[PDB]
Paper text:
The larger, 169-residue LspA is a key enzyme in the lipoprotein processing pathway of Pseudomonas aeruginosa. LspA functions to release the signal peptide from prolipoproteins and is inhibited by the natural macrocyclic antibiotics, globomycin, and myxovirescin. It is a promising target for the development of drugs that combat antimicrobial resistance. In meso crystal structures of LspA in complex with globomycin and myxovirescin reveal that the enzyme consists of four transmembrane helices with periplasmic extensions that include an amphiphilic β sheet region, referred to as the β cradle, and a flexible loop with a short periplasmic helix.
Numbering used by the authors:
A (entry chain E): 201 to 204
B (entry chain A): 2 to 158
Write the structure that this text describes.
């Protein structure tokens, strides 16, 4: 989901 | 009335709003900054930047580079589907969980859009404390994802  | 004939779907407009806000956020700092150039706002705590995270945090799982663009995009695709039916199942008055699902969904779709259009993910918020440490850059999508996780984690109390 997030950037990483 | 119209409010009930759509169900809990009108909550998607918060998802639509976050996606739009995050896409203009990226489009500004892209065409405004250079890669890793930082515009200092609070000299020792905060600045604007233009880092492109290719998802290189999980590089330890393979001796290739590029599969994060797909493994993570697929994650967002499937996760979004289970979070769409989850919002449909909710009821009136569960406005805490309706906001939380819309927040998490909106952010993940804004980063899924990145990985499907441009191989990386645009990030533009470098929170730091002097040269002591530098938190990784993120965007409005990460901000929406992180808030929605908090709202769900404080719904099990
Ligand atoms: C590159 C930027 C792309 C972003 C541009 C995307 C435009 C999509 C917006 C609206 C159409 C689909 C509506 C999606 C929201 C559904 C809301 C809903 O389900 O409720 C139905 C009814 O409108 C009760 O409000
Ligand atoms: C990343 C930060 C971006 C910030 C994004 C804003 C955060 C949302 C705040 C207020 C929602 C505005 C009100 C919109 C409510 C519409 C949804 C709705 O009314 O759903 C009714 C449903 O039918 C009942 O069962
Ligand atoms: C939180 C809900 C609010 C809505 C979400 C928006 C907030 C996101 C932050 C910034 C967006 C872009 C704002 C741009 C501000 C920086 C402009 C700038 O510093 O430009 C420097 C110029 O290049 C001269 O050197
Ligand atoms: C909790 C809700 C949070 C709401 C957050 C959304 C508000 C607007 C977005 C950022 C404000 C930060 C302001 C920083 C922009 C000023 C940049 C500037 O000072 O100009 C650039 C200059 O060249 C270098 O000093
Ligand atoms: C409210 C708006 C909601 C929008 C939500 C964002 C949608 C994400 C964008 C496309 C996904 C569709 C997948 C279609 C297949 C894309 C093919 C592709 O990934 O192209 C790769 C590249 O062009 C070759 O190197
Ligand atoms: C009604 C819903 C309101 C919606 C809330 C609007 C107010 C935003 C408040 C604070 C900003 C939150 C910023 C969260 C920062 C998360 C940083 C993060 O996700 O981690 C980055 C990671 O290191 C790399 O991927």
């Amino acid at each position: 989901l997030i950037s990483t | 009335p119209d409010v009930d004939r759509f169900g809990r779907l009108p909550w998607l407009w918060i998802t639509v709003l976050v996606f739009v806000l995050d896409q203009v956020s990226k489009a500004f700092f892209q065409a405004e900054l250079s890669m890793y150039q930082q515009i200092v706002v609070i000299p020792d705590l905060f600045s604007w930047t233009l880092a492109y995270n290719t998802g290189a945090a999980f590089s330890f799982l393979a001796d290739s580079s590029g599969w994060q663009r797909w493994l993570f995009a697929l994650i967002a695709i499937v996760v979004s589907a289970s979070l769409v039916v989850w919002l449909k199942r909710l009821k009136k008055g569960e406005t805490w969980l309706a906001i939380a699902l819309a927040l998490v969904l909106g952010g993940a779709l804004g980063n899924l859009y990145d990985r499907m259009v441009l191989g990386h993910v645009v990030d533009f918020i470098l929170v730091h404390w002097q040269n002591r440490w530098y938190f990784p850059a993120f965007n409005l999508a990460d901000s929406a994802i992180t808030v929605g996780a908090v709202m769900l984690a404080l719904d099990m109390f």
